[PDB]
Design an enzyme around this catalytic site. Structure first.
Site, PDB file in Angstrom:
ATOM      1  N   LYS A  11       0.725  -1.163   0.001  1.00 24.51           N
ATOM      2  CA  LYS A  11      -0.093   0.008  -0.023  1.00 24.51           C
ATOM      3  C   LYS A  11       0.706   1.269  -0.008  1.00 24.51           C
ATOM      4  CE  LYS A  11      -3.691  -2.341   2.501  1.00 24.51           C
ATOM      5  NZ  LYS A  11      -4.443  -2.825   3.544  1.00 24.51           N
ATOM      6  N   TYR A  51     -11.830  -5.003  -3.362  1.00 28.19           N
ATOM      7  CA  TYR A  51     -12.277  -4.813  -1.979  1.00 28.19           C
ATOM      8  C   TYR A  51     -14.118  -4.917  -2.296  1.00 28.19           C
ATOM      9  CZ  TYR A  51      -7.849  -3.571   0.003  1.00 28.19           C
ATOM     10  OH  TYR A  51      -6.650  -3.469   0.781  1.00 28.19           O
ATOM     11  N   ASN A 114      -2.059   0.454   7.112  1.00 34.12           N
ATOM     12  CA  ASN A 114      -1.485  -0.516   7.741  1.00 34.12           C
ATOM     13  C   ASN A 114      -0.528  -1.313   6.366  1.00 34.12           C
ATOM     14  OD1 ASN A 114      -3.311  -1.776   5.909  1.00 34.12           O
ATOM     15  ND2 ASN A 114      -4.060  -3.255   7.365  1.00 34.12           N
ATOM     16  N   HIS A 117      -0.918  -5.175   1.962  1.00 34.97           N
ATOM     17  CA  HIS A 117      -2.372  -6.091   1.928  1.00 34.97           C
ATOM     18  C   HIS A 117      -1.684  -7.596   1.303  1.00 34.97           C
ATOM     19  CE1 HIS A 117      -5.453  -8.351   0.108  1.00 34.97           C
ATOM     20  NE2 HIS A 117      -5.077  -8.305  -0.849  1.00 34.97           N
ATOM     21  N   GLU A 128      -7.296 -12.213  -6.949  1.00 41.66           N
ATOM     22  CA  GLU A 128      -6.480 -10.903  -6.972  1.00 41.66           C
ATOM     23  C   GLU A 128      -5.295 -11.016  -7.910  1.00 41.66           C
ATOM     24  OE1 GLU A 128      -7.499 -10.418  -2.451  1.00 41.66           O
ATOM     25  OE2 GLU A 128      -5.407 -10.335  -2.965  1.00 41.66           O
TER      26      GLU A 128
HETATM   27  N1  LIG Z   1     -12.013  -0.608  10.536  1.00 47.19           N
HETATM   28  C1  LIG Z   1     -11.386  -0.276   9.580  1.00 47.19           C
HETATM   29  N2  LIG Z   1     -10.762   1.388   9.393  1.00 47.19           N
HETATM   30  C2  LIG Z   1     -10.358   1.483   8.261  1.00 47.19           C
HETATM   31  N3  LIG Z   1      -9.895   0.903   7.458  1.00 47.19           N
HETATM   32  C3  LIG Z   1      -9.782  -0.607   7.451  1.00 47.19           C
HETATM   33  C4  LIG Z   1     -10.786  -1.032   8.710  1.00 47.19           C
HETATM   34  N4  LIG Z   1     -10.862  -2.230   8.526  1.00 47.19           N
HETATM   35  C5  LIG Z   1     -10.059  -2.832   7.509  1.00 47.19           C
HETATM   36  N5  LIG Z   1      -9.494  -1.626   6.891  1.00 47.19           N
HETATM   37  C6  LIG Z   1      -8.880  -1.600   5.740  1.00 47.19           C
HETATM   38  O1  LIG Z   1      -9.398  -2.621   4.714  1.00 47.19           O
HETATM   39  C7  LIG Z   1      -8.542  -3.595   4.326  1.00 47.19           C
HETATM   40  C8  LIG Z   1      -9.295  -4.985   4.260  1.00 47.19           C
HETATM   41  O2  LIG Z   1      -9.966  -5.413   5.192  1.00 47.19           O
HETATM   42  P1  LIG Z   1      -9.839  -6.860   5.618  1.00 47.19           P
HETATM   43  O3  LIG Z   1     -10.034  -7.730   4.376  1.00 47.19           O
HETATM   44  O4  LIG Z   1     -10.959  -7.226   6.760  1.00 47.19           O
HETATM   45  O5  LIG Z   1      -8.432  -7.213   6.271  1.00 47.19           O
HETATM   46  P2  LIG Z   1      -7.291  -7.803   5.643  1.00 47.19           P
HETATM   47  O6  LIG Z   1      -6.706  -6.636   4.644  1.00 47.19           O
HETATM   48  O7  LIG Z   1      -6.351  -8.209   6.775  1.00 47.19           O
HETATM   49  O8  LIG Z   1      -7.490  -8.777   4.815  1.00 47.19           O
HETATM   50  C9  LIG Z   1      -7.591  -3.473   5.431  1.00 47.19           C
HETATM   51  O9  LIG Z   1      -6.230  -4.070   5.124  1.00 47.19           O
HETATM   52  C10 LIG Z   1      -7.395  -1.993   6.116  1.00 47.19           C
HETATM   53  O10 LIG Z   1      -6.452  -1.592   4.899  1.00 47.19           O
END
Ligand SMILES: Nc1ncnc2c1ncn2[C@@H]1O[C@H](COP(=O)(O)OP(=O)(O)O)[C@@H](O)[C@H]1O
Ligand SMILES: Nc1ncnc2c1ncn2[C@@H]1O[C@H](COP(=O)(O)OP(=O)(O)O)[C@@H](O)[C@H]1O
Ligand SMILES: Nc1ncnc2c1ncn2[C@@H]1O[C@H](COP(=O)(O)OP(=O)(O)O)[C@@H](O)[C@H]1O
Ligand SMILES: Nc1ncnc2c1ncn2[C@@H]1O[C@H](COP(=O)(O)OP(=O)(O)O)[C@@H](O)[C@H]1O
Ligand SMILES: Nc1ncnc2c1ncn2[C@@H]1O[C@H](COP(=O)(O)OP(=O)(O)O)[C@@H](O)[C@H]1O
Ligand SMILES: Nc1ncnc2c1ncn2[C@@H]1O[C@H](COP(=O)(O)OP(=O)(O)O)[C@@H](O)[C@H]1O
Lengths: 151, 151, 151, 151, 151, 151
Positions: A11, A51, A114, A117, A128
């Site tokens: 990211k 997403y 974070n 991904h 993906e």
């Molecule tokens: N509560 C939140 N607030 C803001 N951004 C979020 C939140 N939860 C997830 N995200 C964003 O959406 C992405 C995708 O979420 P998710 O698929 O649940 O987790 P992962 O990325 O670990 O697969 C995360 O990596 C993050 O960038």
């Protein structure tokens, strides 16, 4: 061995905060094989399809915006349990739950920034990979250490 | 600052010996900006045009073969004196003359397996960038540290 | 052994780019003893008394302002020839002339943002130390590794 | 490739200051091959013979005593010009004279506590190998990456 | 973002074993912001007040004496949940109980020589900040990467 | 303090993949004392006496062969709970269950190529030590940092 693949994306915070070499290094030194690698300003359409399972979520819009606001590094990595173990290497979705030793645990703080991904499953990773990479762009070769990595 | 660019290539020994993350890290931490990044199995035609000024040389054939025998990492990096200083960072063409601290001085031994190529000049780098990269693939953005890197 | 001391300051660009720990590490692993360590926004007066000899020059105006625009890590290190060797570890004043393996050679690009300062002589060092530190802030103690660093 | 070998010893100060891994890592990452490795307290006799060409030096008696005052890591390493490039990696006899990026330049200060020894020629080094090791202690194998380190 | 702060002290053993830079580097690379930094020999009085909630413990008198037996690096760090995540980074009170990847898990062995202190709560930590620092010693600035660390 | 010892061996995959220095580093920086260090092609007999308890199992056949197919770095380390903590630093036997920050978690993928072995109890360790090392090869000395590692 195993030719299983995963999609990993750095990211735009990761690129901004100079964590690319360091993130790649951790996959290299683990024994995983670099399959595909692209440095791309990604699109809203691309990101929305990626997403889609979170369309129902309040953060979606902001997420796509944050994800569109700078260059990303698109990556494919090959190896045994690479989807699963690569997610362990990333740590938890929320950096505050990610253990020290992981990428997020070591390098970032807040869920919305974070740095990285990873494919949540093989199914997802394939979806993906295809979404992000053309088959032309995927490179195939044999690691000179392969027999020391896998029995 | 300076928007000057260079082409840097990680030769297939570098990929094989797991030096990609580490090579990128050294450019990141220096302050240079990642512009373009590709992981590609490169062609003989591509390589011959790139290494045309050495057509007259006994090693040419082998060089192109070594350069074709595995995946490379094609890279563009932006910054002040980036062509020149990036070559200092690589060290000398022959690893046995490259000082410790440089990429080749630290990571390799023999001239014919010197892990990495860098643009010998701006002219060459532009020629090389264009040869290796499409303008679509080059990404432009601003480093969040730019004002601390350049006055 | 030797009780020679030098003054080393990390500049605001050094702090902003997350290089404080890396730099201190370099002095530690070398075997030099940490004597003094503070973190401060340096007043314009102090910066003018510090850079006094470069008043005439044309970059003095922007210099003081930039060195006041953020925090500095001010340090005192002790050991045999710290002053002279400290300057070698830092690299040449201009990062373009700084060799890989040096602090400036590894981590920065332009002289206006050259991340760090070290005293140029024993005389200057002791002057700078008197200027940036209060005597009571210089800590005395013996390295547990002392007999393994010095005959 | 090349089957040339050199002798490297980590001196008692290098062991005491925690640099065994760091030093091995530099030779490993350079592409050189580990042949022999042992941990021992060297005798005065062995050390007097090791350093026989220096028996007429003012520092000789203390060198011997210092080298006998704790354990050393004796190693044998193989590769093209490993003797000469191994010495470049170590730095100069005097750490003050050694450049950042070198083992002594980075990790030590004083000539009498310079953490490491390296063979100064092919002939010296084989003499040193025969002296610290029996041929049966030297291990023969082929690096999985050898085609990628040597043409 | 978040303006929450914590107190971190590098204990005398951490200073003596060369881990000041390493430890600062981990907090820097995590995205946390350095606010306060000083080097000092802590008094018994200060240390008795610092550790007042433990005055009734069998290890208290020795803890105080050990903490007084050499200099410490006192720091203040800022960021979202920096107190709690700062503690996760340190490990457990007992190094044996601390996981690889943590500061104590990687760098130390014994509970009475656990190299580092961290505030155990927001309230403790501010009490600790007011005790080791004057507010004027704490430096305010904005990270150039803050938009990329926090949404 | 504590004089407990364990036996740690780097396997041939560990050596082939250039991880010897990295691994030794991990034990050094932790504060454990190097007692014993050899480099050897282990005879089939020794490997059978070492792995005696796993004769019945179906991977014993390929095990001995693979552990004889290249060199091993055999080590003895000393300190408080080395045995138990050494195993934690290594990670779980199967790298897929090994947490990031551990040796296996960071550097390898499949259990058949799990890079390293550590003794599972004080009993096993002392047995393994008697088996791989001659008594005279275990070196006694005191860390210069001893009083800073142990109360
Ligand atoms: N509560 C939140 N607030 C803001 N951004 C979020 C939140 N939860 C997830 N995200 C964003 O959406 C992405 C995708 O979420 P998710 O698929 O649940 O987790 P992962 O990325 O670990 O697969 C995360 O990596 C993050 O960038
Ligand atoms: N004597 C040689 N033997 C084998 N290969 C060589 C030799 N000289 C150069 N090469 C190869 O050709 C490449 C191009 O050579 P040159 O342009 O002279 O140096 P550089 O790569 O430093 O610009 C080198 O990086 C190396 O891979
Ligand atoms: N031409 C220049 N433009 C901008 N800044 C400069 C220039 N020359 C020197 N400086 C800055 O002024 C500082 C003092 O200069 P000088 O004393 O010559 O170098 P040093 O600090 O290495 O002794 C340098 O550290 C540098 O950051
Ligand atoms: N002037 C000196 N004082 C103390 N020790 C010295 C001095 N010169 C050399 N030595 C020690 O003797 C060792 C052997 O010296 P020499 O063979 O001249 O250098 P090298 O080790 O580079 O071959 C050195 O590695 C050093 O530890
Ligand atoms: N059993 C013990 N023996 C010696 N020292 C101890 C012991 N328990 C705690 N200490 C020391 O006292 C410090 C404060 O203890 P405590 O506040 O309980 O842990 P923490 O530092 O994790 O908050 C510890 O960091 C440690 O150095
Ligand atoms: N299912 C398996 N297939 C191949 N090799 C194995 C398997 N299980 C264990 N091994 C190997 O045998 C060694 C001994 O097994 P065990 O004693 O259970 O683990 P450890 O060495 O961690 O105590 C392990 O280090 C591992 O490399």
């Amino acid at each position: 061995a195993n030719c299983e693949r995963t999609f990993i994306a750095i990211k735009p915070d990761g690129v901004q905060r100079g964590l690319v070499g360091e993130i790649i290094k951790r996959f290299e030194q683990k024994g995983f094989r670099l399959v595909g690698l692209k440095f791309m300003q990604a699109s809203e359409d691309l990101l929305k399809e990626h997403y889609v399972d979170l369309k129902d979520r309040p953060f979606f819009a902001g997420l796509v915006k944050y994800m569109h606001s700078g260059p990303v590094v698109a990556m494919v990595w090959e190896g045994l349990n690479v989807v699963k173990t690569g997610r362990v290497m990333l740590g938890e979705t929320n950096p505050a739950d990610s253990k020290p030793g992981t990428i997020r645990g070591d390098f970032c703080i807040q869920v919305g920034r974070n740095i990285i991904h990873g494919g949540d499953s093989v199914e997802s990773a394939e979806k993906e990979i295809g979404l992000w990479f053309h088959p032309e762009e995927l490179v195939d070769y044999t690691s000179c250490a392969q027999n020391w990595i896998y029995e």
